[PDB]
Design an enzyme around this catalytic site. Sequence first.
Site, PDB file in Angstrom:
ATOM      1  N   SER A 180      26.125 -41.082 -21.001  1.00 51.10           N
ATOM      2  CA  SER A 180      27.379 -40.381 -20.861  1.00 51.10           C
ATOM      3  C   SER A 180      27.108 -38.896 -20.735  1.00 51.10           C
ATOM      4  CB  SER A 180      28.293 -40.652 -22.039  1.00 51.10           C
ATOM      5  OG  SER A 180      29.565 -39.999 -21.909  1.00 51.10           O
ATOM      6  N   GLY A 181      27.728 -38.254 -19.777  1.00 48.56           N
ATOM      7  CA  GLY A 181      27.446 -36.835 -19.678  1.00 48.56           C
ATOM      8  C   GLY A 181      26.204 -36.474 -18.880  1.00 48.56           C
ATOM      9  N   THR A 185      28.929 -39.263 -12.329  1.00 48.78           N
ATOM     10  CA  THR A 185      30.095 -39.070 -11.500  1.00 48.78           C
ATOM     11  C   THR A 185      29.914 -37.876 -10.560  1.00 48.78           C
ATOM     12  OG1 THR A 185      31.312 -40.103 -13.340  1.00 48.78           O
ATOM     13  CG2 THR A 185      32.578 -39.430 -11.435  1.00 48.78           C
ATOM     14  N   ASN A 226      31.259 -35.665 -23.498  1.00 51.77           N
ATOM     15  CA  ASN A 226      31.621 -35.171 -22.212  1.00 51.77           C
ATOM     16  C   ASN A 226      33.101 -34.943 -22.179  1.00 51.77           C
ATOM     17  OD1 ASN A 226      32.017 -34.942 -19.322  1.00 51.77           O
ATOM     18  ND2 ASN A 226      30.913 -36.866 -18.886  1.00 51.77           N
ATOM     19  N   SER A 229      34.742 -37.667 -19.486  1.00 52.55           N
ATOM     20  CA  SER A 229      34.025 -38.952 -19.392  1.00 52.55           C
ATOM     21  C   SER A 229      34.747 -40.078 -18.694  1.00 52.55           C
ATOM     22  CB  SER A 229      33.781 -39.466 -20.789  1.00 52.55           C
ATOM     23  OG  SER A 229      32.689 -40.329 -20.784  1.00 52.55           O
ATOM     24  N   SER A 230      34.026 -40.839 -17.880  1.00 55.23           N
ATOM     25  CA  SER A 230      34.642 -41.986 -17.200  1.00 55.23           C
ATOM     26  C   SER A 230      34.525 -43.141 -18.186  1.00 55.23           C
ATOM     27  CB  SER A 230      33.820 -42.423 -16.017  1.00 55.23           C
ATOM     28  OG  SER A 230      34.368 -41.863 -14.856  1.00 55.23           O
ATOM     29  N   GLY A 450      23.979 -46.689 -18.195  1.00 58.05           N
ATOM     30  CA  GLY A 450      22.723 -47.390 -18.314  1.00 58.05           C
ATOM     31  C   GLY A 450      22.883 -48.002 -19.755  1.00 58.05           C
ATOM     32  N   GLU A 452      23.305 -48.831 -23.585  1.00 57.38           N
ATOM     33  CA  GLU A 452      23.981 -48.095 -24.591  1.00 57.38           C
ATOM     34  C   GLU A 452      23.455 -48.513 -25.932  1.00 57.38           C
ATOM     35  OE1 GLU A 452      28.364 -48.645 -24.358  1.00 57.38           O
ATOM     36  OE2 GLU A 452      28.408 -47.157 -22.675  1.00 57.38           O
TER      37      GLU A 452
HETATM   38  N1  LIG Z   1      24.449 -31.151 -10.575  1.00 60.52           N
HETATM   39  C1  LIG Z   1      25.305 -30.660 -11.493  1.00 60.52           C
HETATM   40  N2  LIG Z   1      25.685 -29.361 -11.413  1.00 60.52           N
HETATM   41  C2  LIG Z   1      26.546 -28.867 -12.335  1.00 60.52           C
HETATM   42  N3  LIG Z   1      27.103 -29.440 -13.355  1.00 60.52           N
HETATM   43  C3  LIG Z   1      26.731 -30.713 -13.463  1.00 60.52           C
HETATM   44  C4  LIG Z   1      25.874 -31.390 -12.624  1.00 60.52           C
HETATM   45  N4  LIG Z   1      25.758 -32.693 -13.096  1.00 60.52           N
HETATM   46  C5  LIG Z   1      26.549 -32.739 -14.188  1.00 60.52           C
HETATM   47  N5  LIG Z   1      27.160 -31.575 -14.451  1.00 60.52           N
HETATM   48  C6  LIG Z   1      28.331 -31.306 -15.294  1.00 60.52           C
HETATM   49  O1  LIG Z   1      28.138 -31.909 -16.559  1.00 60.52           O
HETATM   50  C7  LIG Z   1      29.312 -32.668 -16.927  1.00 60.52           C
HETATM   51  C8  LIG Z   1      28.973 -34.150 -17.185  1.00 60.52           C
HETATM   52  O2  LIG Z   1      28.580 -34.814 -15.945  1.00 60.52           O
HETATM   53  P1  LIG Z   1      29.240 -36.195 -15.377  1.00 60.52           P
HETATM   54  O3  LIG Z   1      30.695 -36.216 -15.618  1.00 60.52           O
HETATM   55  O4  LIG Z   1      28.935 -36.350 -13.898  1.00 60.52           O
HETATM   56  O5  LIG Z   1      28.412 -37.212 -16.235  1.00 60.52           O
HETATM   57  P2  LIG Z   1      28.474 -38.855 -16.433  1.00 60.52           P
HETATM   58  O6  LIG Z   1      27.092 -39.357 -16.249  1.00 60.52           O
HETATM   59  O7  LIG Z   1      29.419 -39.397 -15.431  1.00 60.52           O
HETATM   60  O8  LIG Z   1      29.114 -39.180 -17.867  1.00 60.52           O
HETATM   61  P3  LIG Z   1      30.031 -40.340 -18.490  1.00 60.52           P
HETATM   62  O9  LIG Z   1      29.186 -41.621 -18.630  1.00 60.52           O
HETATM   63  O10 LIG Z   1      30.541 -39.954 -19.846  1.00 60.52           O
HETATM   64  O11 LIG Z   1      31.258 -40.548 -17.677  1.00 60.52           O
HETATM   65  C9  LIG Z   1      30.186 -32.542 -15.744  1.00 60.52           C
HETATM   66  O12 LIG Z   1      31.507 -32.196 -16.072  1.00 60.52           O
HETATM   67  C10 LIG Z   1      29.595 -31.915 -14.776  1.00 60.52           C
HETATM   68  O13 LIG Z   1      30.481 -30.923 -14.242  1.00 60.52           O
HETATM   69 MG   LIG Z   2      31.161 -40.523 -15.438  1.00 59.47          MG
END
Ligand SMILES: Nc1ncnc2c1ncn2[C@@H]1O[C@H](COP(=O)(O)OP(=O)(O)OP(=O)(O)O)[C@@H](O)[C@H]1O
Ligand SMILES: [Mg+2]
Length: 738
Positions: A180-181, A185, A226, A229-230, A450, A452
């Site tokens: 997460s985070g 996404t 996050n 978070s999705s 991935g 948990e």
């Molecule tokens: N390449 C990047 N550049 C800038 N910020 C990033 C980048 N990747 C991630 N972040 C920032 O970090 C935060 C967390 O990333 P993201 O939402 O894509 O993670 P996640 O893997 O989907 O998490 P989750 O499983 O909780 O949904 C974001 O809000 C995002 O803006």
């Molecule tokens: Mg996500």
Amino acid sequence: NPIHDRTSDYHKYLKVKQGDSDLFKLTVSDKRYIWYNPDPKERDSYECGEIVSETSDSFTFKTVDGQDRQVKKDDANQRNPIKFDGVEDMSELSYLNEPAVFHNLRVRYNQDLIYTYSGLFLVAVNPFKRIPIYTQEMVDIFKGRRRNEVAPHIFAISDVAYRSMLDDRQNQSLLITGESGAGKTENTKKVIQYLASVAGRGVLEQQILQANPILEAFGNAKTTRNNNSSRFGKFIEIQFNNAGFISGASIQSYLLEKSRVVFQSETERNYHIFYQLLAGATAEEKKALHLAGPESFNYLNQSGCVDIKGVSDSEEFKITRQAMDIVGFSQEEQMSIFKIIAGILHLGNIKFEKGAGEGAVLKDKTALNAASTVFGVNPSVLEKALMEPRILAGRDLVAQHLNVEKSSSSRDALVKALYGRLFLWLVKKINNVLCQERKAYFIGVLDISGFEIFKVNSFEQLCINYTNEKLQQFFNHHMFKVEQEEYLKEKIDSQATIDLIDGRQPPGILALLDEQSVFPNATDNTLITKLHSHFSKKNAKYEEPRFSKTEFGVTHYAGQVMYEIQDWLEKNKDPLQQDLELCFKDSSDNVVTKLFNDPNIASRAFITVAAQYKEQLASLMATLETTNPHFVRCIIPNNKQLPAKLEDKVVLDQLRCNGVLEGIRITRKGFPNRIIYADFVKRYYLLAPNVPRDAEDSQKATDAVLKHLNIDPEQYRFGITKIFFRAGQLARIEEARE
Ligand SMILES: Nc1ncnc2c1ncn2[C@@H]1O[C@H](COP(=O)(O)OP(=O)(O)OP(=O)(O)O)[C@@H](O)[C@H]1O
Ligand SMILES: [Mg+2]
């Protein structure tokens, strides 16, 4: 030409800075180092130590402190020559140990270089700050470029997939997972962005793009890990015609976290939509909806957090409302979705009181009546259905008076169904709009977590983990074949875990769970007992705890995960009082009626949640099985959501769980370094007498150096086009004298 303009942002942000000299000579040194654990307890924290001497069997090095130690050459984590520091593919390293791997990764991150390949994988480290490498100008540069031609980047993997699609006439898949985070996404949105640009012509593209934001408002929330978070997994089908242009899209959602709707841990928030609504609703919408502040709602007033820093729920509500408009949701449709959101807030406001007897009562009809109006259902029927549902006790159908607890719990059950169902509906509604029956090809994106392994792991973690054992085995198989292909082009374990979980005969965990499900009177204890009975000391991947009586452990790919059984029975059944459905089926609302009157929405099939999960996972795998896949591993650098903070332990743990390090160790045993004749010579001609950088018979020249150097033939292997080197070989080579 940005790729050539050393002044370009491309160079700046995507490449390791290049000087004026190529000369092998710069990099010359006589020092040799190893990666060592200064504190044997903390094995992921290593330090560099120079090797001061050597025995035939060991190594003797000096620590940072100047403390000398000895190590077995075989247990040694030798450090690659400095020249390797920052390569774009870990597959390029000579010494492939764990510390060496993190190092390269770190050298790169230190320069803001978030993308690095590891053979088949694209590793992506969350920067935790903005990096301007996603602009249209950035997009245009990746167009048609081979992986080897350009720097590591999500756009790059996306281009490869699209070219492969067009050239092979084969469908494709991008699998993006990680914690997460970690940034899944984010990368997912880039893939789409890129595709839309490289293959679009727009209206559809628009609607496609605009889908996301809709999904985000309803399935995303602020958690401790996050801010956005999705709380659901997804599979995105980007559809194209035989011409290579986007024709449509289809979305598949999974494992939505409904629980969040009626409860959030301190500091977290409910789904973004609740807030957007509360904030950007017209003052004239609020009254119509009996709206107030989040503080006025039980479902929003409990984590002690109602807003997000650097976020305007009202601004966002505009955004969401627009996307809906673009996608095509009629105002009337939009209304109803909001009404539902509303009703849901009202339902949580209902206070069950039960003093009169032992059955609950409603002294205040306020909230109740609020729900009813917005739902377009009857308050009296709602009321009864909630505290006095008729339950089939044999041949008779008798209405039972429910107590408070039970009462609240049903009401919650109702709310979760509303939500989950509305979620399905939106997904459906969107697919209708963009989805094509008649499509030629497709590129699919899977974005989900991935493995948990939390503090507490429940049913949902089993499920996700299960999915991941399958993805990992898929990767493993895929990796096996392509490795063989390549070794072939040139003259040169999860089953048991999976079975324990999804086995039929003997029955695995899920089969036992379904079984207990048939019994109205079964309990967590009966369930956990049945599980140990069948696997304790009997199945090698299972473990019965020494003292807990409510948990059991599964040895997964990632390692052991301990699960807790509470509410699994209920979760597997996902029960909702029929009177409730009854009540809602008559709903005056055109959107409400669907949630309940549509078998595609209101019902699983008869099948249990677990049965449905298994099925969907299989269809998923099946589909994947027909594509050429691509793997992206998103890595969180720390647990603080901070930049310039890359924690070895945090990182190492993910590389072990996600298969990157495993893929390495494996490859490490083979012939990991596979170099092109021309490229080899160019850099090492100097190592031997009579070899010009530019030689027409590269293979011959290669042999020259190796021969000059007197390398052990067992260490290298002549390929039809590349020279294959065993681990450590290239290094020493590199370590040779001009
Ligand atoms: N390449 C990047 N550049 C800038 N910020 C990033 C980048 N990747 C991630 N972040 C920032 O970090 C935060 C967390 O990333 P993201 O939402 O894509 O993670 P996640 O893997 O989907 O998490 P989750 O499983 O909780 O949904 C974001 O809000 C995002 O803006
Ligand atoms: Mg996500």
